[PDB]
Design a protein around this ligand. Structure first.
Ligand SMILES: O=C(O)[C@@H]1C[C@H]2C[C@@H](CN3CC(F)(F)C[C@H]3C(=O)O)CC[C@H]2CN1
Ligand SMILES: N[C@@H](CCC(=O)O)C(=O)O
Ligand SMILES: [Cl-]
Ligand SMILES: [Cl-]
Ligand SMILES: [Li+]
Ligand SMILES: [Li+]
Lengths: 253, 251
């Protein structure tokens, strides 16, 4: 009741980072970022104290296809090792079956990162040609979406990416961003990342709108009383304009 | 086992009467995006249902004097319906008294107005009086302005509440007609504006989204269906079916 909540999280720019500071920093104050700002607001609104812990396996949370066991922050919640996961944890069907998410504090989707000043305006324009290469970070959520879409355009896109995978799937986002900057290439990625990048790379832009729709939510264990309280607090923060301010604080270049 | 009662409201392209030459029966009276959503949810979760239009014709807002809710929100509070499947906006005041699914569609408040004018933002509207503006009575857009501490929107509510018999309209239908026939701008959700402006080509959206929010399925507080419907929505989203439904109804 006066117990501190254990908050699992993971390093991910600009959601959660170690703060650079002149002053000495102790404990939770060693961290900063959008999710840390959100956590601070939630703790004030709902009146809890907390302890931030970085997740032991450096994973968000997936289910093993052979033994059915979870990992990452999702596993910490399932096992009641954490009270909250405050991180850009995507709200998905498979996860929502095993933990309880708040309503989303951010809604987003897959989109396209490309250089400015071209006539390409959609995923369709990319799908119906071969001169401009395009791809994604190998094994990421975005690539996974394409590997599964039965939507026409996206199925064609995956045909291309899969065949030319040694050429167009990259091992990291920075590798991908450099390819967009130095060659005739477009990168499929989450729109939150694209915005972060385009605020810092004035010669790049998002192409088109969103290709899918999904949200990031605060994770709680199934049955947690904090889930609905956090949802109401998030909705109020949104309506008051405060999450929008928080987003601009951490994303603007 | 037993049919659920589903409350909803007439609002195109979400819910509308299906055109026919002879009377249609029961649920077959209706079509639209939300009618298709309801059908898909019923398939995943395995329930039958009877659609009933909300008895008082309202989305739902709190009466300031006695504190009581009306509309679909009140029907859920009083267990007059099991679900509300409708373009029902998820707001923190409503989430305190009913249980929403996670959102099936995102949206934001924006402005519907005639083309070709110098007006480009809520601020332009707030800072003059010639052009009147309003919203649908007892919906979340009205309630956003009524509660807003943001200076521009607080100003707009001052205007609107002063002239509420005038500028607060009974329905989007009435609001659209007012935009078309008088010097009036309608504060309307962006999804609905996108539908309207594809049909009325002398109308346009002014500015961007004022806020960001979603539509959810409403259930009574504590309903077992709330989390089931959330999981079904995520399945439909990830399968691309919500996107296909949006393409069908916003052509
Ligand atoms: O919950 C999750 O699994 C993900 C993890 C993490 C995923 C990144 C994006 N991916 C990182 C990646 F680089 F590995 C590929 C990229 C993508 O798939 O587009 C954005 C912030 C997160 C959002 N939620
Ligand atoms: N979707 C709104 C109604 C429309 C509006 O207020 O603009 C609601 O749930 O109240
Ligand atoms: Cl204690
Ligand atoms: Cl929820
Ligand atoms: Li869940
Ligand atoms: Li609620």
């Amino acid at each position: 009741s006066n117990r501190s909540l254990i908050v699992t999280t993971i390093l991910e720019e600009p959601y959660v980072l170690f703060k650079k500071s002149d002053k000495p920093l102790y404990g939770n104050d060693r961290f900063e970022g959008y999710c840390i700002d959100l956590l601070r607001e939630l703790s004030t609104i709902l009146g809890f104290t907390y302890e931030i812990r970085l997740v032991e396996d450096g994973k968000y949370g997936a289910q093993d296809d052979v033994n059915g066991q979870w990992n990452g922050m999702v596993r910490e919640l399932i096992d009641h090792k954490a009270d909250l996961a405050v991180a850009p944890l995507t709200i998905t069907y498979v996860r929502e079956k095993v933990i309880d998410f708040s309503k989303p504090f951010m809604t987003l989707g897959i989109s396209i990162l490309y250089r400015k000043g071209t006539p390409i305006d959609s995923a369709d324009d990319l799908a119906k040609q071969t001169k401009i290469e395009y791809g994604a970070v190998e094994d990421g959520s975005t690539m996974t979406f394409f590997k599964k879409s039965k939507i026409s355009t996206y199925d064609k896109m995956w045909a291309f990416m899969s065949s030319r995978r040694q050429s167009v799937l990259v091992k990291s986002s920075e590798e991908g961003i450099q390819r967009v900057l130095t060659s005739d290439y477009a990168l499929l990625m989450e729109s939150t990342t694209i915005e972060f990048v385009t605020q810092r790379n004035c010669n790049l832009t998002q192409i088109g709108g969103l290709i899918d729709s999904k949200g990031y939510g605060v994770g709680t264990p199934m049955g947690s009383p904090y889930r609905d309280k956090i949802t109401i607090a998030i909705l109020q923060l949104q309506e008051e304009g405060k999450l929008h301010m928080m987003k601009e604080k951490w994303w603007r270049g």
